[PDB]
Protein backbone atom coordinates (compact mmCIF):
# COMPACT_ATOMS: atom_id res chain seq x y z
CA UNK A 1 0.00 0.00 0.00
CA UNK A 2 1.24 3.56 -0.92
CA UNK A 3 1.02 6.66 1.38
CA UNK A 4 2.31 10.23 1.62
CA UNK A 5 3.86 11.50 4.88
CA UNK A 6 2.73 15.10 5.50
CA UNK A 7 5.49 16.90 7.45
CA UNK A 8 3.82 18.80 10.38
CA UNK A 9 6.64 18.13 12.82
CA UNK A 10 5.94 20.19 15.97
CA UNK A 11 8.48 22.94 16.56
CA UNK A 12 10.18 23.01 19.98
CA UNK A 13 9.90 19.28 20.89
CA UNK A 14 12.72 17.80 22.94
CA UNK A 15 14.87 15.22 21.14
CA UNK A 16 15.51 12.73 23.99
CA UNK A 17 17.75 9.71 23.27
CA UNK A 18 15.95 6.33 23.57
CA UNK A 19 17.23 3.60 25.94
CA UNK A 20 16.67 1.48 22.86
CA UNK A 21 14.81 1.50 19.54
CA UNK A 22 12.78 -1.51 20.65
CA UNK A 23 9.06 -0.78 20.05
CA UNK A 24 6.69 0.86 17.63
CA UNK A 25 3.48 1.75 19.54
CA UNK A 26 0.02 1.23 17.98
CA UNK A 27 -2.51 3.83 19.30
CA UNK A 28 -5.92 5.24 18.38
CA UNK A 29 -7.34 8.66 19.39
CA UNK A 30 -10.45 7.32 21.18
CA UNK A 31 -12.11 10.48 19.69
CA UNK A 32 -15.25 9.86 17.59
CA UNK A 33 -15.58 13.59 16.57
CA UNK A 34 -12.04 14.77 15.67
CA UNK A 35 -10.40 14.81 12.23
CA UNK A 36 -6.69 14.07 11.75
CA UNK A 37 -6.23 17.88 11.19
CA UNK A 38 -7.98 18.58 14.57
CA UNK A 39 -5.69 15.97 16.26
CA UNK A 40 -2.53 17.49 14.73
CA UNK A 41 -3.49 21.07 15.70
CA UNK A 42 -4.42 20.02 19.24
CA UNK A 43 -1.23 17.98 19.82
CA UNK A 44 0.91 20.88 18.42
CA UNK A 45 -0.55 23.16 21.12
CA UNK A 46 -0.50 20.53 23.95
CA UNK A 47 2.76 18.64 23.27
CA UNK A 48 4.03 19.40 26.79
CA UNK A 49 1.23 17.08 28.06
CA UNK A 50 1.62 14.31 25.41
CA UNK A 51 2.81 13.70 21.81
CA UNK A 52 3.30 10.79 19.38
CA UNK A 53 5.29 10.65 16.09
CA UNK A 54 2.51 9.98 13.48
CA UNK A 55 -1.25 10.22 12.95
CA UNK A 56 -3.05 8.05 10.36
CA UNK A 57 -6.57 8.96 9.24
CA UNK A 58 -8.76 11.11 6.98
CA UNK A 59 -8.74 8.31 4.37
CA UNK A 60 -5.22 6.89 4.66
CA UNK A 61 -3.41 10.23 5.18
CA UNK A 62 -0.23 10.22 7.31
CA UNK A 63 0.79 13.30 9.31
CA UNK A 64 4.18 13.18 11.00
CA UNK A 65 4.20 15.34 14.18
CA UNK A 66 7.57 14.24 15.70
CA UNK A 67 10.89 12.77 14.52
CA UNK A 68 11.37 9.05 15.07
CA UNK A 69 14.24 7.49 17.07
CA UNK A 70 13.72 10.04 19.92
CA UNK A 71 11.47 9.87 23.01
CA UNK A 72 7.84 10.72 22.30
CA UNK A 73 5.44 11.31 25.21
CA UNK A 74 2.82 8.80 24.04
CA UNK A 75 2.57 5.75 26.30
CA UNK A 76 3.99 6.43 29.79
CA UNK A 77 7.57 6.57 31.01
CA UNK A 78 8.51 2.88 30.42
CA UNK A 79 7.31 2.57 26.78
CA UNK A 80 8.41 6.15 25.95
CA UNK A 81 12.08 5.29 26.75
CA UNK A 82 11.97 2.32 24.24
CA UNK A 83 9.65 3.51 21.40
CA UNK A 84 11.25 4.36 18.01
CA UNK A 85 7.82 5.66 16.85
CA UNK A 86 4.26 6.00 18.13
CA UNK A 87 1.49 5.80 15.49
CA UNK A 88 -2.07 6.98 16.25
CA UNK A 89 -5.16 5.92 14.22
CA UNK A 90 -7.94 8.57 13.91
CA UNK A 91 -11.54 7.32 13.89
CA UNK A 92 -14.10 7.30 11.06
CA UNK A 93 -17.73 6.06 10.73
CA UNK A 94 -17.21 5.48 6.96
CA UNK A 95 -16.22 1.95 5.79
CA UNK A 96 -14.47 3.30 2.63
CA UNK A 97 -12.44 5.75 4.77
CA UNK A 98 -11.67 3.00 7.34
CA UNK A 99 -10.29 0.54 4.75
CA UNK A 100 -7.85 3.25 3.55
CA UNK A 101 -7.00 4.34 7.11
CA UNK A 102 -6.36 0.73 8.27
CA UNK A 103 -4.28 -0.44 5.27
CA UNK A 104 -2.06 2.65 5.65
CA UNK A 105 -1.89 2.20 9.49
CA UNK A 106 -0.64 -1.44 9.00
CA UNK A 107 1.85 -0.45 6.24
CA UNK A 108 3.29 2.47 8.29
CA UNK A 109 3.67 0.41 11.53
CA UNK A 110 5.61 -2.27 9.52
CA UNK A 111 7.61 0.38 7.57
CA UNK A 112 8.75 2.03 10.84
CA UNK A 113 9.51 -1.30 12.59
CA UNK A 114 11.57 -2.47 9.56
CA UNK A 115 13.50 0.87 9.43
CA UNK A 116 14.29 0.55 13.22
CA UNK A 117 15.41 -3.12 12.88
CA UNK A 118 12.39 -4.24 15.02
CA UNK A 119 10.61 -7.58 14.36
CA UNK A 120 7.10 -7.58 12.86
CA UNK A 121 5.34 -9.25 15.83
CA UNK A 122 2.38 -7.79 17.77
CA UNK A 123 2.37 -7.68 21.58
CA UNK A 124 5.12 -10.35 21.88
CA UNK A 125 6.63 -11.07 25.32
CA UNK A 126 6.45 -8.89 28.41
CA UNK A 127 9.65 -6.77 28.76
CA UNK A 128 11.52 -3.83 27.18
CA UNK A 129 13.94 -6.46 25.65
CA UNK A 130 11.03 -8.03 23.69
CA UNK A 131 11.22 -5.81 20.56
CA UNK A 132 8.22 -5.44 18.20
CA UNK A 133 5.00 -3.60 17.46
CA UNK A 134 3.11 -3.04 20.74
CA UNK A 135 -0.43 -1.87 21.36
CA UNK A 136 -0.90 0.77 24.07
CA UNK A 137 -2.80 -2.11 25.79
CA UNK A 138 0.35 -4.29 25.95
CA UNK A 139 2.31 -1.38 27.49
CA UNK A 140 -0.43 -0.93 30.12
CA UNK A 141 -0.60 -4.71 30.83
CA UNK A 142 3.19 -5.46 30.92
CA UNK A 143 5.15 -2.22 31.82
CA UNK A 144 2.54 -0.03 33.48
CA UNK A 145 3.03 3.76 33.62
CA UNK A 146 -0.32 3.91 31.74
CA UNK A 147 -3.68 2.09 31.78
CA UNK A 148 -4.91 2.73 28.16
CA UNK A 149 -6.18 -0.23 26.15
CA UNK A 150 -6.04 1.09 22.52
CA UNK A 151 -6.38 0.25 19.76
CA UNK A 152 -8.40 -2.97 20.20
CA UNK A 153 -11.90 -1.57 21.15
CA UNK A 154 -11.90 0.60 17.96
CA UNK A 155 -10.53 -2.16 15.69
CA UNK A 156 -13.10 -4.58 17.20
CA UNK A 157 -15.97 -2.16 16.24
CA UNK A 158 -14.77 -2.59 12.61
CA UNK A 159 -14.68 -6.42 12.95
CA UNK A 160 -10.85 -6.67 13.43
CA UNK A 161 -9.67 -8.82 16.40
CA UNK A 162 -6.17 -8.66 17.92
CA UNK A 163 -5.48 -11.96 16.04
CA UNK A 164 -6.63 -10.36 12.73
CA UNK A 165 -4.47 -7.24 13.36
CA UNK A 166 -1.41 -9.49 14.01
CA UNK A 167 -2.13 -11.44 10.78
CA UNK A 168 -2.65 -8.14 8.77
CA UNK A 169 0.72 -6.77 10.00
CA UNK A 170 2.39 -10.13 9.02
CA UNK A 171 0.75 -9.88 5.50
CA UNK A 172 2.50 -6.47 5.00
CA UNK A 173 5.94 -7.95 5.92
CA UNK A 174 5.04 -11.21 4.06
CA UNK A 175 4.64 -9.46 0.66
CA UNK A 176 6.97 -10.98 -2.04
CA UNK A 177 10.03 -8.66 -2.24
CA UNK A 178 9.07 -6.69 0.93
CA UNK A 179 12.74 -7.30 1.93
CA UNK A 180 15.95 -9.05 0.71
ZN1 LIG B 1 -2.73 5.08 23.10
Numbering used by the authors: 2 to 181
Kindly provide excerpts from the paper associated with this entry.
The X-ray crystal structure of the PlyP100-D1 domain was solved to 1.80 Å resolution. The enzyme adopts a globular, mixed α/β/α fold, consisting of a central β-sheet (β1-β6) surrounded by six α-helices (α1-α6). The structure contains a single zinc ion, which is coordinated by residues His28, His137, Asp151, and His177, the latter of which results from the C-terminus of a PlyP100-D1 crystal contact. The identification of this zinc was not verified experimentally; however, its assignment is supported by analysis of the site using the Check My Metal (CMM) webserver, and is further supported by its tetrahedral coordination, favorable hydrogen bond distances, and coordination through histidine and aspartate residues, which are consistent with what is observed for catalytic zinc binding sites in proteins. During refinement, it was evident that there was clear electron density for the entire C-terminal His-tag, which was non-cleavable and therefore not removed during purification. Thus, the interaction with His177 and the aforementioned zinc ion is not present in the native enzyme and is merely an artifact of crystallization. A structural similarity search was performed using the DALI webserver, which indicated that the PlyP100-D1 domain is most structurally similar to amidases from Gram-positive bacteria. Following Cα-atom superposition, the PG was shown to be positioned in a mostly negatively charged Y-shaped crevice in PlyP100-D1, with the zinc ion situated at the branching point of the glycan and peptide chains of the PG substrate. The mutations E89A and H137A, which we propose to be important for catalytic activity, eliminated the function of PlyP100-FL against the cocktail of L. monocytogenes strains, and H149A severely impaired its function.
PlyP100, from the GRAS Listeria phage P100, is one such endolysin that can prevent the growth of L. monocytogenes in both lab culture conditions and a miniaturized queso fresco model. Our current research focuses on the Listeria-specific N-acetylmuramoyl-l-alanine amidase PlyP100, an endolysin encoded by the bacteriophage P100, which cleaves PG at the amide linkage between the first l-alanine in the peptide chain and the lactyl group of MurNAc. After unsuccessful attempts to obtain a crystal structure of PlyP100-FL, analysis of an AlphaFold model suggested the endolysin is actually composed of three separate domains (D1, D2 and D3) separated from one another by long flexible loop regions. Our data argues that D1 is entirely responsible for catalytic activity, D3 is sufficient for cell wall binding, and D2 is necessary for full function of the enzyme, especially in food-relevant conditions.
